[PDB]
Structure formats: structure tokens, C-alpha cells
Symmetry: C3
Subunit: 274 residues, 3 copies
Amino acid sequence: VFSVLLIFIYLLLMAVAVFLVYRTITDFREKLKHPVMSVSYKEVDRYDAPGIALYPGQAQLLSCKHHYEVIPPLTSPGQPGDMNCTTQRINYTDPFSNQTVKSALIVQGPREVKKRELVFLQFRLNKSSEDFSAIDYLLFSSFQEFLQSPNRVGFMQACESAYSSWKFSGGFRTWVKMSLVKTKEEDGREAVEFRQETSVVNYIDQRPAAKKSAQLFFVVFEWKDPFIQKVQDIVTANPWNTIALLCGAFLALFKAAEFAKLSIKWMIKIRKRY
Amino acid sequence: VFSVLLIFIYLLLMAVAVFLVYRTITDFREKLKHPVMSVSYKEVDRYDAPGIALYPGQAQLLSCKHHYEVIPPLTSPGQPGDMNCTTQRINYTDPFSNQTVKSALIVQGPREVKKRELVFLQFRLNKSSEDFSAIDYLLFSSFQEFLQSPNRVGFMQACESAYSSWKFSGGFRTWVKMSLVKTKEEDGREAVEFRQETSVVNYIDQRPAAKKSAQLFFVVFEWKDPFIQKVQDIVTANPWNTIALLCGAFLALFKAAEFAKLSIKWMIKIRKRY
Amino acid sequence: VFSVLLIFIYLLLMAVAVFLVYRTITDFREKLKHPVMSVSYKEVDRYDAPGIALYPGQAQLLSCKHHYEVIPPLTSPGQPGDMNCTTQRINYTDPFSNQTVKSALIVQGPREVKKRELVFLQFRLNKSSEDFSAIDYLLFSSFQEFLQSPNRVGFMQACESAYSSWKFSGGFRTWVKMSLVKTKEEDGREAVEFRQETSVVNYIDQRPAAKKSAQLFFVVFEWKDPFIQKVQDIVTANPWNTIALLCGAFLALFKAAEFAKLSIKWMIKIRKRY
Ligand SMILES: Cc1cc(-c2ccc(/N=N/c3ccc4c(S(=O)(=O)O)cc(S(=O)(=O)O)c(N)c4c3O)c(C)c2)ccc1/N=N\c1ccc2c(S(=O)(=O)O)cc(S(=O)(=O)O)c(N)c2c1O
């Protein structure tokens, strides 16, 4: 049976090999899916001029100011003037219904983050029967790409279908801080997405001191921090390394079996002593 | 007196082996206490009816509409009517103080994200000496489960102790989104957590145009996107692979020692040439 | 030509070795640029008192109270009283411009999260021509460390440079919630950051019911959850040469090649049999 004992060592080795193979294959199956993610933060000297698409509707733009200081100056309510920005009016068909042309007002944003550059926009809307005043706006990465790239309808259609719009209220100013997150998929595209944290500041009617009762909106756009987020869905399943380790483990089993065979020859000598 | 020269590389090799073992055990110990995080997404054609747990207390319900258009239509002030919602009133002893009982009403939330159906409901509360108005509310995964599972009080106690209880103001509309994140514990249980980003839009007192001083609440629940987040806690450095790695390193080190000793025998022949 | 064919195993071996070296070099050179992020949550029985800094300017505090009960009490606004907080006024020059000296107040935060401790602060401000009333506040890890550490101006300069400041409006309260995120940087250092999610509730003017129309701001500070969130970036393998890995793989592969070539020598015996 001693022959069967050496084959018993061999069968233990084979069972270990079977367990190793099945464990490794199921581990590789699991690791192919459920990839882990990594986040890296980069710094930018000055953000690329972003694009803000407003949808005022029946409300006209009173004053747009590109203010460098982090403290905007005083304002004269309902006083047209002080327009030193860039604006383009567009008529594009929303993909949702292909029946309502959603007029858009496209405006350049702030670039110099380190000088706390910000954009101040004032809007006036004559009282109506809406019962709820709101404005919806959208953000996209670059404005010069929009201006230069032909078929602007196409670019903003892609923007609207891809990104999301979050409306700001009326009757009190809204402070908006933007942040950029870049994600890479299997196709190697650096998709850019925007995030914002809002902080509404109430507006005082004491300054007007009039009976007009006309709703006013104020928006402030600013860059939160120079840091840009970059999320990568990293993959830790390397077929070549796993195959190399599998072969190494197989040959380790075989060579440990050779060591055990040398020990079993020692034991054969032992038996010969007895 | 050269056997020590032959064993010099042997002792260096054993030092290498000790260093490798210490480093590997330290790495495994560090890895067993620092699990990694992963995130996954999916496209879902129809969400499961989420829970609604408004706690009016002393404010009655005037209207609750299950709209299917992203833009709710015009609404008159006050004038209760148009009840097209499913409601269930439940009383349960608090799970924190066991002193007070908070009467709650449960509503069925939007299901179709693709049609972007919203639920728009409004409450009014007569003048009171509170001087501050606000209504609590919390969400849970499903409403049909709660309707069917007996011993409701226990389910609500668990939901309240687990899910966060948010608060929405009174006096203007609070467009509230939703989003689901699902996590798997080491046991294997699936825990679903709600998170959302509210958006406040102001009311207008012109529509009432009366001296009533009555609160007019307004809430709009809506699904954000057809993406359900999953967070997974991946554990790296499984033990069998590490053991196989260490054994293979030992075998390779010993075979390198044997090859080096054969080459040292050749070099000793060379020395014999001198 | 049979000699070359006998070495053909060697040609394939050299190709495999080139591929393996290139793949491992590129992979482990690419694995340092983007490490892997890991997260965890720690439960804390009771937080360390944090320091809450405010910049009232022309505003004067009216009442600061700690409230262990979840529901804060109701009072008559406009009457100073019930001051049960600790404050240490400071006057320091900001780092951004080194020209504006900004007097700042500091108050003790809520410690016992389990007992539901919330800090209630009332501020009063006379009507002016500002047209936009807001107060910006900051959070630092522990007020006590500030009291103990000399050169306190330096501590707040560092705090202002590091942390971000977000303001709350004037006219309705704000129920600020706080949470702590700890991240370890590569240089053996731990950084603590504050996160929050505001929730504004409208304030009712019925209590004054007078023509003064003075501005009142109400702030509540609470702890979101006792959990502290730690995030750390960790690497994969840090050998800087990983010479042992590929060396052992190569030696194992070469010994396997030697055994297969002995088998091919048996095959040479075969060919001799023809
Ligand atoms: C020594 C060392 C090892 C590792 C490490 C290596 C591998 C690994 N996991 N996986 C694999 C996978 C496959 C393997 C294969 S294959 O399947 O056939 O391909 C074969 C073989 S083998 O049979 O040849 O052994 C393997 N061992 C394989 C393997 O280990 C893991 C998880 C870890 C990592 C680090 C490491 N030594 N690190 C050092 C080592 C030294 C450092 C030194 S020192 O002055 O030299 O003391 C200084 C400094 S400092 O100046 O920055 O302070 C350091 N940072 C030092 C340092 O970081």
C-alpha cells in the first residue's frame, strides 16, 4: 500500500491543485466585474471659460457684470445698464418632444479662479399669473468650442441630452459654486461633468421702497476651488499575472511533491532500518 | 577554509527570505484592515414605488396630484380638491422616547422615471403661535411591502431608526429629487439608502391677495435619474494566493541557491586552475 | 535543422520573457500615478467640542443656547437674554489681502451627539443699505485647542487658508448639520474637514408685528450622524524594482523548460525510432 501512500500524497497535491484552480478562476470572474475606482485631484491655473445657458423665457436681462472681486458692489434695482459680457441667442429643438423650440441665452463664464472672478446677473420679469417664478439654467465645459463648432443646435442638443439642468429661484439672489469632475470609460473618453452647491441669500425690498411689486432674480456664478476631480474606474484583473501565478503554483506543487518524494525516500530508508 | 565563502551567499539568501516573510505578513495584516471601495451603476426602466412619510400633525391635505409632465400646470391658491393619491394613516410609539406618538400618513411615490412622473401635493395650516413652520418626512424603499407586511408599527420603527428624517419648509415650493444607493454587508444583506438634493423656489403672495396669514405648503417629489448606485466593499489579498506566493518565492529562492551553488562549484574549479 | 527546432522552445521562451518584462514594467510604472482610494466609518460615542466662528460685523448677538431636546423652545424675539455660551472675541487680519482686519466671534459647538445637542443662535441687525444681508461662518476642529495654543492669530490664519467658508442668509433660519471627514496624506499627516447640508425654514413676522422691520437671523447647529468618515489613498505593490517576482517566475519557467526539453530528448529518441 506504500505505493498507494505515495499516490495518496499525489492525490492530496491534486486536490490542492483543483481547489487552487477553482478558487483562482472564480476570483478572476469576480475581479473582471466589480472594478474598484480611484480619485485624483489636479490643480488648474485658470479654468477654461465655461458656458452658462439660461432660459429666461419672458424675462429680460438687466445687467451682467464680470466682477473680479469676491465681494460684488452695490446694485440699483430695476436700473438697466452695466452690460460687459458676451451673449448669444439660440433656438434649438429639445429632443424630449421635438415640438417645443426652447430659446436659450448662452453666456460666457469666469476663468480666473485665483482672483475670485465671478459673474453677476440681474433679471426682471413682469408680474403674471404663473404663481411660481423660476429660471432653469445649464452648464457646459467650454464656450469657445460652442461658438466655433458649426451646427450649434447640435452641440446644445447633445449637451441637453447628456447633462442635467437645475433651476434657480426668484425673489432672492442665488450663489452658485461650480466644480468639474472628469471620468474615463472603457472607450477612453474624458467625459466632463459639473457639480454645484447652492447658497441662497435673501433680497431686501427696503431699497426699492416702491409699489411696483415686480419680481427680480439675481444670480452669482463662481468657481468653488481650483481643484478638478478625476475618477477612474480602475481594473485590477490582469490575465497574464494570474496565469503566471497559476503556473508557478502548479510547479511549486510539483516541486514540493519532489521534496516530499525525497523525504519519502528517507522514510523508505527508515523502513529498511526497521 | 572556503566553506564559509560558499555559505556567505546562503546566509544572505536566508536574510532575504526572512525579509520577504516579514514584508508579506505585514502587507497582509495591513490589507485585512483597509478594505477598498467600488461603485457600480445601472439603467433601470421603472423604479419601485418609493415610500413617503409626511408628518403633518396639525395640517390637513388639500391636493395631491400624480402628474406625468415635467412641468406641473397652473394651480389655484387654497381651494382643496383633486385627491388622486393613495394614503394610509398609521400611529406608532416613537422608537426614541416611548413617550410621544407621532401620527403619520404614507403616500405612494412616483414610479416611472422615464415618463418623469412627479407627485405634487400642497398643505395649509391656519395661523398659529409657532412662529416657525416646517414639516418632516422620510422615505423608504417600497410602499407595497409595508402595505402587505403585518405588524406595521415594527416596520415603521425600523424605517425611522434607519432612514434619515428630512424636513421641508412652509411658505414656498421645495422641488425634491430622489436617488437610491445600495450597499452589501459582510453578511450579505442589501441595505438601501435614500439621498436627494432639494431645490427651493419662492411663492408669491399676489395670488392669495387676501388677509388670511395662512401657510400654504408645496412639495414636489420626483425621481432624479434612471441610475441606482451600488457601493461594494471589496476585500483584497485573499489568503490562499498569498500563501502560494510565499511558497513559490521560497522554492524559487532555493532553486536559485542551488543554481548559484553549481556555478560556485564551477568557479571553484576555476580557482583550482589558479 | 533539428538543433534549432530543439531550441525553438527557447525562442518562444525569449518572446514570452520579453512580453512579460514589458508588461510588468509598464503596469507597475502606471500603478504609481493613480493609487486606489479606500473609505471607512468610525462610530464615536461623543464628539470633541468644535469651534464655530462667525463674522457678524455690525450685527450683535441676542441669545446663544444649548438645547439637548430635539425641539427647540419658542420665545418672543427682540429681547436679549438667556446667554449660556462661551465666546472669545478676536481681531485678526485676513491672508487674502492683508489689508482688511475682520473681527470674529467664536462659540463652542455641540458635543453630545447622542443626547441630541443643538446650538441655537439669534442675531439682530438694523436695517441698512446693504440690500443683501448674509453672515459667513467657519468651523474648526476644537475650540479648546484654540484657547490653549498661543499665537492664536496664526491658528485662525491657517484655518481660514485651509477650510472653506459658506454663509447663511438673513430673514429665515438655517438648520446646519455637521460631519467630519479625515484624510491622511502621504507625508504622515492627518487632515480633518467639515461637511454640511443646510436646510432653511421660513421665519414668520407675526411675532414682531411692528413697523421696525429689523432683520433677525436664526441659526441651529447639529451633528448629522455620529460617524466619522475616513478616506485614504493606498498603493498596490511598493517594491520599486519587484525583481524577486519576475526573477522567481523566470527561474520556475526555465526549470519547466529544462524538464520539457528532457521530454523532448525522449522525443529525440522517438525520432531515432523514426
Ligand atoms: C520586496 C517587496 C515585495 C512587494 C510585493 C511583491 C509582490 C506582491 N504580490 N504579488 C505577486 C504576484 C506574482 C508573483 C509571481 S508570478 O505569478 O509568476 O508573476 C512570482 C513571484 S516569485 O516566485 O518570484 O517570488 C511572486 N513573488 C509574485 C508576487 O509576489 C505584493 C503584494 C507585494 C512589495 C514591496 C516590496 N519591497 N518594498 C520595499 C523594499 C525596500 C525598501 C527600502 S530598502 O532600503 O531597500 O530597505 C526603502 C524604502 S524607502 O526609502 O521608501 O523608505 C522602501 N519604500 C522600500 C520598499 O518599499
